[PDB]
Amino acid sequence: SGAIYVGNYRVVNRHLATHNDWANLVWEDSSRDLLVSSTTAQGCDTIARCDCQTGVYYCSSRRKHYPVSFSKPSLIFVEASEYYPARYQSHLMLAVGHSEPGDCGGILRCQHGVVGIVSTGGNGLVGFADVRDLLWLDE
Ligand SMILES: CSc1cc2c(cc1NC(=O)N1CCC[C@H](C(N)=O)C1)CCC(=O)N2
Ligand SMILES: [Zn+2]
Questions:
Q1: Is 50 annotated as a binding residue?
Q2: One domain, residues 35 and 56
Q3: Atom of ligand 1 nearest to the CA of 15
């Protein structure tokens, strides 16, 4: 589990979004596993606007933060699941690191702020849904 609170928005994994998220929907994209809903309070997370390929992520299955090198946002094949058929997920960045399904929502951050959230994993690899291109989260 896990979300990004910036301004009047809440950013979560689309496959984990609540009824409240869908009732206050701003934008969703199944191909990125992202959903953004509106909030009544002011979130204080800062979004990074950079091309960093190093950062730190929170791994709930280990109650620990891990430093990682990660790839640039790209289209990557993601095996079928209870939430989606087999498909290419866009804007995904991979890193060598531990992850388990309940780890989705863990934040990835660089020295410039929030980079994205855990969205995929499998065989000593963790995938992150990038959020740095969503310039409207700030405005
Ligand atoms: C960190 S998630 C994860 C971690 C692990 C495993 C599976 C997942 N599940 C995943 O990749 N999903 C399902 C949930 C929607 C995901 C999606 N974006 O379509 C795709 C298998 C065991 C393991 O070592 N790590
Ligand atoms: Zn950065």
A1: yes
A2: no
A3: 15
d(CA 6, CA 29) in angstroms, rounded, equals 18
Residues 77 and 100 grouped into a single domain: yes
40 and 52 housed in the same domain: no
User: Would you say 91 is a known binding-site residue?
Assistant: no
Q: How far apart are CA 111 and CA 48, in angstroms?
A: 8
CA distance 34 to 30: 7
Alpha-carbon Rg for the chain, nearest whole angstrom, is 14
**Nearest CA among 33, 130, 136 for reference residue 73:** 130
- Establish whether 15 is a catalytic residue: yes
How buried is 10 (Cβ within 10 angstroms: 0-12 exposed, 13-18 middle, 19+ buried)? Answer: buried
Experimental method: X-ray
Considering the domain architecture, whether residues 72 and 134 belong to the same structural domain is answered as yes
Q: How many domains does the chain contain in total?
A: 2
The protein residue whose alpha carbon is closest to atom 20 in ligand 1 is 120
- For the beta carbon of residue 78, count every other beta carbon within 10 angstroms: 18
**Total residue length of the chain:** 139
**Cβ pair 9, 45 in contact under 8 A:** no
Three-state helix/strand/coil letters over 48-72: CCCCCCEEEEEEHHHCEEEEEEECC
